[PDB]
UniProtKB/Swiss-Prot annotation, chain A:
Residues represented out of the complete protein: 3264 to 3564 of 4405
Organism: Severe acute respiratory syndrome coronavirus 2
Subunit details: 3CL-PRO exists as monomer and homodimer. Only the homodimer shows catalytic activity. Interacts with host FBXO22; this interaction promotes the proteasomal degradation of nsp5.
Effect of residue 49 to A: Does not affect ability to cleave and inactivate human TRMT1
Effect of residue 189 to A: Does not affect ability to cleave and inactivate human TRMT1
Name assigned to this protein: 3C-like proteinase nsp5
C-alpha cells in the first residue's frame, strides 16, 4: 500500500540522450536507431528570434555544421531534414541501446514521465500531466530543451513530448515527436500566453478512488448527482467538464470499490463546497489531478 | 522555472536488478560484481516468518535451492552467507553493468530515490525521505521486497536502502545494504508500530527557499528570530530541532535569495501559528519536508549524471 507520484524507470531513455550543437547553440537530442531528433530552434541565431524562416535557415546548413556528441564520442551526421518543429539528423551509427519504441500524441489529462537533461546528460526524472490548456507544469532550466516525456507500460517506450520552451508564466510548451506543438504555441519569441488552466476532473475522481482503496473513507457521503448537475457545479470551481467517456473509464474503479461514479461525483461536489477542514487525503490538503485512472489501477493493483 | 519532486535517473540501478527465488518465495535482488544481495526472509515461508531462526534455515540450504534470474538468464549460485538481515549469494558471473558504487547509511531527514521492482523488473521510481521515526512513506505491493533506494554523487551510486516490509499503518521499513534496519523493527510477522513522526524542519526551510527562487514570496516578512526561540516553537508543533549545522547548510540559499535562515524561520513560525490563510506555496497547501537543502540546490542549478 501507499500512494505516491511515481515515474517510469528512466534507463531506456537515458541510453538515447545526446548533445546537439549548431553554432553557439547547444541542446539535447534523442538518438533512436540512426536518427537524432531535436527542436528545430537549435538552428536559430540571436537575430532570428521573432520570425525565423526555418526552411531558409536550414537550406544554408551542411551536415558538418551539426555536432552530435553521445557520451565521449562524436557521431557523424550524414543527413538532415525538418518535420514540423523537429529536426531529424541522420547519423552514421545506429544507437545500440535503442529500446522498443513508438511515438504517440497524447490528449489533455494524460500523464507522462519527464527525463530532464542538460548537455545530453540526465539530471532527474519526474511525473507531469498535459494540462487542459496544453501546457505542462515542469521543472526546466536553460538548456533543457530537447528533454523528452514518455511512458513505458510494458517494455515499449512511448515518446509523447519534446520540450521546447517556457512561457512568461513559468509553464512549459513543447511538441510531439512528429514536431507538432501541443496547443496554440509556435517556436518563435512572439508574445504568446496560455489559456486559464482548469482542474482535470476525471483524474481527481481517480485519485479519490485511490484514497478509498488505501483505506480513506471520511469524504464519502450518501448523495448522488446527475452528470449535468455535477458539471454545472464543477465549472464554477474551474473544473473541466466530466464527459460520459470519463464516466465509462472510471467504471473499473467504481466496481472495485463499490462506489458508483456519480456517487463519487457528489463527494467531490461536497469537498469543493466545504474544503478539507484540517484533514488530508493521501497526504494532501488539496485535491490532486495528475493521476489518471490507468495510473491508479497500475499503482494500486 | 518550476519545482517538482524529482528522482535521480535510475538507469545505473536498473541494470543491477534480478529475481531471487527460494522455494515458493520470490523477491528482488541487487547484482553487483559477483554477489546478489537480497532480504534474508527469502528463505522463509509464512510459518517461518512468525518466529524465524535464520541461522538454522540457512545452514540447511543448498546453493541450488536459490534460483537467480537476470532477465531471461539463470545465474549460478556458488555460495551463500548472511550479514545481519541481508543474504549474499555468490554467483559465477560478474554483472557487466555493475556501476561505480558504495554502500552508505543515511540519517533521518535525508532523501533518496526508490526503484520499485517486481520479479526482478523495475516498475517505478520515486523520491522518499527517511522519516524521523525511521519509516519511509513509500508505495509498495506484494513482491516489492528487495527493491532499493539510492543517491548519485558524481558518477557513483550510493546505495542506502533495501525494502523489507510494510507495517500495519501502511508505511514501510527496511535496511541498509549491510542488513541493519533503519528504526526499531525486526524481520518477523508480529505486531510492530513506528513512533509518532515529526516534521523535518531543515527540509521545510529548504523548500521555502525553493519557493522564493521560483517567485512565490507572500509568506516572507520583516521579522527574524533566535535559534532558541524558534526551537521552542518547533517543539510545540512536533517539528524537529534546527541545529547550527542545519543553519550552516542553508547558508548558500540564504546568500542567493537575500533571506537569512532566522528570517526564514520567522516566516515558518508565522505559518505554523496562523496557517496559510487560503494561500498555497509551490502549489501545496501543506508545508513540504521531503526536499533537502542539497536537493533544492541541485534542482535549481541543473546538475547532471551522465
Ligand atoms: C533550450 N531550452 C531552454 C529552456 C529554458 C527554460 C525553460 N525551458 C527551456 N533554454 C535554452 C537556452 C538556450 C538554448 C537552448 C535552450
Ligand atoms: C516481499 N515484500 C512484500 C511486501 C508487500 C507490501 C509491502 N512491502 C513489501 N511482500 C511479499 C510477499 C511475498 C514474497 C515476498 C514479499
Ligand atoms: Cl525582528
Ligand atoms: Na547522454
Ligand atoms: Na456520495
Ligand atoms: Na522574516
Amino acid at each position: 500500500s501507499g500512494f505516491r507520484k511515481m515515474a517510469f524507470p528512466s534507463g531506456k531513455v537515458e541510453g538515447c540522450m545526446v548533445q546537439v550543437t549548431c553554432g553557439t547553440t547547444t541542446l539535447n537530442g534523442l538518438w533512436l536507431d540512426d536518427v537524432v531528433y531535436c527542436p528545430r530552434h537549435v538552428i536559430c541565431t540571436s537575430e532570428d528570434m521573432l520570425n525565423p524562416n526555418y526552411e531558409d535557415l536550414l537550406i544554408r546548413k551542411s551536415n558538418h555544421n551539426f555536432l552530435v556528441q553521445a557520451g565521449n564520442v562524436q557521431l557523424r551526421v550524414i543527413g538532415h531534414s525538418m518535420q514540423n518543429c523537429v529536426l531529424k539528423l541522420k547519423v552514421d551509427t545506429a544507437n545500440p541501446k535503442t529500446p522498443k519504441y513508438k511515438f504517440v500524441r497524447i490528449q489533455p489529462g494524460q500523464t507522462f514521465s519527464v527525463l530532464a537533461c542538460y548537455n545530453g546528460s540526465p539530471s532527474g526524472v519526474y511525473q507531469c500531466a498535459m494540462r487542459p490548456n496544453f501546457t505542462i507544469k515542469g521543472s526546466f532550466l536553460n538548456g533543457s530543451c530537447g528533454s523528452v516525456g514518455f511512458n513505458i507500460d510494458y517494455d515499449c517506450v512511448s515518446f509523447c513530448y519534446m520540450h521546447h520552451m517556457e512561457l512568461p508564466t513559468g509553464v512549459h510548451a513543447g511538441t510531439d515527436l512528429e514536431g507538432n506543438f501541443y496547443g496554440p504555441f509556435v517556436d518563435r519569441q512572439t508574445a504568446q500566453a496560455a489559456g486559464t488552466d482548469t482542474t482535470i476532473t476525471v483524474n481527481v475522481l481517480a485519485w479519490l478512488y485511490a484514497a478509498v482503496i488505501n483505506g480513506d473513507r471520511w469524504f464519502l457521503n450518501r448523495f448522488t448527482t446527475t452528470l449535468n448537475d455535477f458539471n454545472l457545479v464543477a465549472m464554477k470551481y474551474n473544473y473541466e467538464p466530466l464527459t460520459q467517456d470519463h464516466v465509462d473509464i472510471l467504471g473499473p474503479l467504481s466496481a472495485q470499490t463499490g462506489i458508483a461514479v456519480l456517487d463519487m461525483c457528489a463527494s467531490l461536489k461536497e469537498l469543493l463546497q466545504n474544503g478539507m477542514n484540517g484533514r488530508t487525503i493521501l497526504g494532501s490538503a488539496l485535491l490532486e489531478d495528475e493521476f489518471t485512472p490507468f495510473d491508479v489501477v497500475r499503482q494500486c493493483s
